[PDB]
């Protein structure tokens, strides 16, 4: 699946990994993250992530 980078702190959201400690199963597409999911390291919102190319 795809990866997305936090443009504030560099955290990589990996769709294959999800973010299960924060309620996000492995395989959750970025688009389907809840609207108020935030970077698990710096706390910024989804708008600050860029999809890896
Ligand atoms: Zn971050």
Numbering used by the authors: 1 to 53
Can you quote the paper on this entry?
The metal binding site-swapped Pf A2K rubredoxin crystallized at pH 5.5 in a P21 space group, with eight molecules per asymmetric unit. In contrast, the P212121 crystals used to determine the Pf rubredoxin structure formed at pH 8.5, with a single molecule in the asymmetric unit. The refinement for all reflections out to 1.04 Å, utilizing anisotropic B-factors and all hydrogens, yielded a final R (Rfree) factor of 13.9% (18.0%). The asymmetric unit is arranged as four pairs of dimers. Residues 20–23 from molecules A-D form an asymmetric interaction with the corresponding loop residues of their dimer partners of molecules E-H. All of the first four molecules of the asymmetric unit agree with one another to within less than 0.3 Å for all sidechain and mainchain heavy atoms, when residues 20–26 are excluded. Despite the differences in sequence, space group and pH conditions, the backbone coordinates of molecule A differ from those of the original search model by an rmsd value of only 0.22 Å, with modestly larger values for Molecules B, C and D. In contrast, the deviations from the backbone coordinates of the search model were approximately 0.6 Å larger for molecules E-H. For Molecules A to D of the metal binding site-swapped Pf A2K rubredoxin, sidechains exhibiting dual conformations are Ser 25, Val 44 and Gln 48. The interactions of the three charged residues Lys 29, Glu 31 and Glu 32 vary substantially among the molecules of the asymmetric unit, with the Lys 29 sidechain exhibiting weak electron density. Relative to the X-ray structure, the NMR-derived structure adopts a differing χ1 dihedral angle for Asp 47 and χ2 for Glu 50. The Asp 35 sidechain of the metal binding site-swapped Pf A2K rubredoxin X-ray structure is rotated out toward the solvent phase, away from the Lys 46 Nζ atom, consistent with the findings of the NMR analysis.
Chimeric hybrids derived from the rubredoxins of Pyrococcus furiosus (Pf) and Clostridium pasteurianum (Cp) provide a robust system for the characterization of protein conformational stability and dynamics in a differential mode. A structure design algorithm was applied to the rubredoxins from Pyrococcus furiosus and the mesophilic bacterium Clostridium pasteurianum (Cp) to generate chimeric proteins in which the predicted hybridization interface can preserve each of the interactions in the parental structures. Interchange of the seven nonconserved residues in the metal binding site region between the Cp and Pf A2K rubredoxins yields two complementary hybrid proteins that are accurately represented as a sum of segments from the parental structures. These "cut-and-paste" models match the ultra-high resolution X-ray models to within the structural variability exhibited by the crystallographically nonequivalent molecules in the unit cell.
